[PDB]
Structures are given as C-alpha cells and as structure tokens.
C-alpha cells in the first residue's frame with residue numbers, strides 16, 4: 001500500500017540483445033564497426049520487446065521480460081559453458097541459443113578480440129586483468145540532463161549540420177565520418193523506442209476500465225510522442241526524456257557506474273512550471289520519483305562468477321546527488337525536488353539508487369536534518385559529500401568555477417563535472433599485497449611463484465630507508481605493467497564495444513567527431529585512475545616497519561617476523577596480539593595516522609607522473625566496491641597482527657576493522673589527517689547504532705561532527721549505516737530469510753543474499769559507534 005510496490009527476482013536469462021545484436025551484425029555486415037553498431041542498436045530499440053507494467057507511469061524498461069538481465073555479447077561471449085541451468089544465473093531450456101551466439105560471437109567479442117591481441121595472457125591477484133576484458137565501462141556522469149534540454153531532434157540537426165557543412169573528407173578521420181552517422185542512427189533509435197510505447201500505451205487506453213489509470217497512460221503516450229525527440233516541457237516529460245537518454249546508452253553498452261547526478265537541479269524548471277501552474281501536485285511528483293527508484297532496478301549485472309568475489313553479485317552505482325550549489329550564483333540549490341527524492345526512499349526501500357547529498361557551508365539545515373533521518377532508518381544511504389575540498393581538486397584540473405560548482409559524482413565516490421570525462425578505465429592494486437611481495441621478494445606467497453622483481457632481500461635491508469626504496473621499486477613495476485595493459489585496452493576497444501550513444505553527452509565529442517573513449521574527450525583528465533583500497537594496512541604495517549623493528553626489538557628479528565607471517569602467527573600467537581595492540585589507524589595517533597597520509601603521498605608521486613589515455617595523468621581513487629575481499633583473500637598475512645586470507649580494509653580512509661578503540665569523533669579526526677585534496681574521491685564509511693541516529697542526538701551530534709569533519713579537516717565524503725552486529729550474524733545464520741536486507745558495503749547498498757561470504761564476515765568485524 002505504501003505508494004510503490006517493488007517485486008521479486010523471479011528472473012531468467014534474456015537473449016533480447018545478444019540475439020538482436022547477432023543478426024544486426026549479420027544483416028549490417030560490411031558497414032564499418034561504428035556504423036554496424038549504430039545500425040544494430042536502433043534495430044534493438046525499434047524492435048526489442050516492449051511492455052508497460054501495472055500502476056506505473058514510466059514506460060521504458062531495462063530488459064525484455066520484467067527483471068531478466070539482458071546479455072551483451074559485443075563485450076564478451078565465451079564464458080557461457082556447461083551446466084544447462086546451474087549460482088544466481090538461470091535459463092529455461094534455450095541453452096542451445098546461448099551456445100549459438102557464443103559460436104557466432106566467438107573470436108569477435110570484446111574480451112574475445114582482446115585476449116588474442118596480447119599473445120601470452122598472464123592470468124592474475126595483484127591487478128584486475130580479468131575485470132578489464134570482462135567488465136563494462138562507465139563510472140561517469142554524462143550530461144544526459146544538462147544536454148537534453150535540446151532533444152534528440154536538436155542533436156540530429158547538429159550531426160546533419162556537421163556531415164554537410166564541415167565534412168570534406170580529406171581523411172578527416174573516416175572513423176569520424178562514420179561516428180557522426182552512427183550517432184544519428186541510434187538517436188532515431190531512442191525516438192522509435194518511445195514512439196513504440198506511444199502506440200502501445202494508446203492501445204492500453206481503450207481496453208482500460210479505470211478512467212484515472214486510463215488518463216494516466218493516455219498522457220504518457222502524449223509524453224512519449226514528444227519526450228525523446230523534442231525538448232521537454234513538463235516535469236512528467238522531462239524525467240521520461242532524461243530516462244530515455246539513460247537507456248539509449250544502456251542499449252549500446254551496459255553502462256556500469258553511470259551517475260545521474262543533480263536531478264534536483266535540472267528537473268526543477270519543469271517542477272517549478274507544473275506545480276505553480278497547478279498541473280502537477282507534490283504527491284504526483286513524489287509518485288514519479290518513487291516510480292523512478294523501481295524502474296531503474298531492472299538493470300541487474302550479468303558477469304562471470306570469477307569476479308563475484310571482487311565485484312559482489314549485484315554492485316550497481318546509480319548515484320544521484322541531491323542538494324548542492326547553484327553554479328552561476330553560488331547560493332544553495334537545495335530545493336523541494338531534493339526533499340521528494342529522499343521522501344521517495346521512505347515509501348520505496350530500494351538499495352541501488354544511491355541518492356547522495358552534497359553539504360556546503362550555507363546549506364539548508366532543515367533538508368540536512370531530514371537527510372539524517374533517511375540514514376537513521378534502514379539502508380546506509382545519503383552519502384554526504386563535502387564540496388569546498390572537492391572544488392579545489394576540480395579547479396586545479398582545469399574546469400571553470402561554474403563547471404566545478406556544477407559537479408556531480410559518478411559511481412561510488414568519483415566526483416567530476418557532467419559532460420567532460422570519458423568512460424573511465426580503472427586499475428586495482430592492493431598496496432598491502434605489494435608489501436607482502438617486497439617483504440617477501442616478489443614471491444606472491446599465495447601463488448608461490450617468483451612472479452615479481454627481486455628488488456631486495458628483507459633479511460638484508462639494513463634500514464627503513466632501504467626498504468621504502470625496495471617498496472618503491474616493486475610498486476613501480478606493477479605500475480608500468482598495469483597501466484600499459486588497460487591503457488592500450490581502452491584504445492583497443494575501438495574494434496569492439498565503443499560507447500557511441502554516450503558521446504551524445506560528452507563535450508567536444510560532437511565537435512571533433514570522436515567518441516569519448518578514444519579521442520573526442522573534452523577532458524582526458526580524471527578519466528583513468530588507480531584504487532589502492534587497503535592503504536590503511538600499509539600505514540599500520542609501515543609503522544611496525546618504522547617503529548619497533550628497525551632500532552630496538554632484535555628478538556622480533558626480520559627472520560622471526562617473516563616466518564611468523566609465513567606460518568600465519570601459528571607458534572607466534574603471542575606476538576600478533578602485541579602487533580594488533582600497536583598504534584593503528586582510526587583512533588587519533590599522529591604517529592600512526594600520518595603514515596597513511598604519506599602513504600597516499602607515496603602513491604600520488606609515482607602515478608601522477610605517469611601519462612594516461614590521450615593526455616594528463618593517472619589519478620588516485622581511494623574508493624572501493626568489493627575489491628578488498630577478492631584481493632585480500634588472496635593477500636596472505638600482514639605484520640600488523642593480520643591473519644592470512646582476510647580482506648584488506650573498508651576503503652580509502654575508513655578505519656581497518658575493530659581498530660577504533662575510540663569514539664566516532666576520533667575515527668574522523670584521524671581520517672581528517674589526510675591531505676585528501678588530490679585524491680579522486682575518498683570512500684569513508686562507518687557504522688552507528690540505531691539508538692544514536694534515531695533521536696535528536698543524530699541530528700545534533702552527527703551534524704556537528706560531520707560538518708566539522710568537512711570544513712576544519714578538509715574531508716570529502718562520509719557515509720553511514722546503522723545496524724547491529726548481531727543483526728548481521730542473525731542474517732548469516734538465516735540467509736534464506738533475510739534475502740531482502742539492505743546492507744551498505746562500499747558506496748552502495750545491496751541485498752544480503754547477493755553478498756559474498758568474505759564481505760559478510762568482514763562486515764561483522766566493523767566496530768560500533770555512539
């Protein structure tokens with residue numbers, strides 16, 4: 001009854017893109033890839049199954065059967081093998097169809113073409129090589145709502161004004177002449193897509209008996225008759241217009257961490273249009289935002305199980321930034337449309353649309369108090385981002401102050417302006433696992449193979465300054481060997497799986513006539529980066545290296561140490577308790593909280609002088625998504641009392657696990673001692689108990705503590721979740737029951753049933769605060 005009604009995961013495998021792209025490549029054979037793609041995608045949207053759900057007033061969906069996740073063979077296809085039905089993956093009996101597409105799309109798929117290119121193929125855990133040929137790229141926020149007040153028609157004109165009055169093909173990239181035609185070809189695709197619903201919604205009208213539900217869709221057909229093609233005019237046809245731009249991208253590439261930030265900023269002129277004109281009510285607007293959280297869900301993920309350890313089983317980042325600052329004037333933009341957004345998170349309790357708030361000095365204290373109740377209930381949501389510091393990072397990249405003020409976020413914590421960055425290609429490297437390799441000697445304990453460089457013998461280091469060069473020499477190897485892989489993989493993805501439709505919403509892409517992935521990016525700045533996930537464990541161990549190994553303590557010699565972790569404290573269980581009691585990050589120890597700052601300052605030195613993509617340099621994104629588990633489980637033992645095969649850390653500057661013997665103010669004062677201005681978004685989450693946040697103390701102690709954390713300490717991002725540790729243990733022993741539990745992990749909340757085991761038991765260990 002609570003306004004909205006989401007439903008169940010009674011889903012099966014769907015072949016409405018794979019089979020529809022397969023015969024698109026065959027019917028449009030010979031046309032260049034830029035055109036053979038664009039011609040096939042409009043074939044999809046104009047021909048794919050369509051339906052309108054019940055009591056919903058949004059039409060376009062992310063699949064051809066309710067919640068059945070589509071499959072894209074353009075990116076990969078040879079991962080569907082022998083089981084016929086068996087593990088969250090299921091089909092009816094059509095396995096002979098997947099093997100038919102896999103037979104066709106063999107050696108012509110993204111990874112399928114990619115894995116030949118190399119030659120030898122080094123399977124890895126120190127870098128996500130498996131997640132770079134298999135995972136779809138997005139993690140941006142294009143201007144599909146900042147550049148959709150023009151409409152698809154206004155786009156096709158600029159393309160037509162381009163192919164005619166500026167072409168003169170003097171090899172002005174035949175690739176560019178074909179990109180232009182392609183971009184039109186699926187711009188009419190998003191027209192046919194919404195003109196199919198108009199004919200179907202109008203058909204769903206006469207046979208309808210409820211006259212209010214009849215007029216509900218009779219206006220939707222009138223919306224979709226003008227929403228995608230021409231510029232929108234009303235709040236009901238501005239949302240549907242923006243959404244169809246999110247789908248046209250999804251039909252060309254399963255847009256991963258695509259952000260849709262600032263819906264409280266660009267749906268306002270129509271919001272302020274219909275309301276003050278009595279055309280739409282606040283509850284009606286709260287209906288669409290409710291119907292927006294539901295319809296966005298169907299985009300489930302469908303990747304091989306070999307990555308579920310590192311990417312969970314349903315890690316979706318559909319973030320939207322509510323609140324903020326008016327760019328042209330500097331005042332606050334926190335408005336009622338932001339109030340209805342987190343009002344929607346009440347009546348519908350979906351965990352994917354992140355719904356993030358952006359704090360700033362003169363923000364609206366009322367709609368920030370009301371934001372603290374949204375995380376006071378279930379779900380660890382409105383991930384408060386602090387501006388002021390993030391602005392300095394964007395302004396020092398090159399963006400103008402208006403572009404910087406107007407920033408949103410893409411994916412987890414990546415903050416960036418809308419239509420400028422271009423489909424990021426990330427790199428994971430557990431800089432605690434590097435410590436394992438150099439404390440060894442490039443041996444990769446879990447693998448027991450001399451796969452690294454013999455930088456130096458630990459039993460012959462002599463001094464700490466000698467170690468940190470043997471740690472630099474080892475880290476730099478996995479730099480020019482990891483970047484060098486997905487650098488020329490973004491370039492290689494020009495023979496397969498480029499993002500043509502997404503270029504409709506990247507600046508200068510239309511002008512230079514080149515896609516955002518390869519070339520026509522307006523800013524090749526924050527477009528490639530690294531995620532160190534567990535660098536707290538670097539500082540905690542570096543402290544043990546700096547303090548209490550070299551100089552004093554020869555009993556805990558370099559020999560007694562390496563063997564203790566070799567056997568994982570077995571026979572040394574007395575020692576680990578002392579190291580686990582040594583000063584650890586998360587409290588308020590400058591002697592231990594400053595080494596994690598120098599830690600990032602050690603990573604920011606090597607990678608920032610490494611060129612990237614088409615220009616600029618690699619960034620450093622300390623965030624995480626689930627890569628602490630799949631990497632830590634293969635990262636064997638650490639000096640700071642760690643056990644062998646356990647996770648790294650909970651991302652960026654979050655305290656390790658049970659290391660905060662001090663209150664919440666310390667856990668942020670520590671995390672504040674990080675010069676996080678040049679850090680591409682920090683993932684900082686911590687757990688409170690519901691007795692603290694569900695009272696005035698939540699909107700009094702926290703606010704005074706989170707505002708102080710960002711203004712005095714220069715933080716960037718803070719995200720909370722309230723849930724008892726027993727409630728998670730009670731979910732571990734009853735996982736058949738709590739299959740719809742909202743648990744935060746790392747910049748998102750996902751159902752506990754699709755969460756990995758190593759992530760569950762790790763979430764038990766996170767401390768409780770008051």
Ligand SMILES: O=C(O)Cc1ccc(O)cc1
Nearest residue numbers: 131132135136137426427
């Ligand atoms: O988000 C990540 O860090 C992993 C990733 C790698 C490649 C890709 O295409 C998508 C995601």
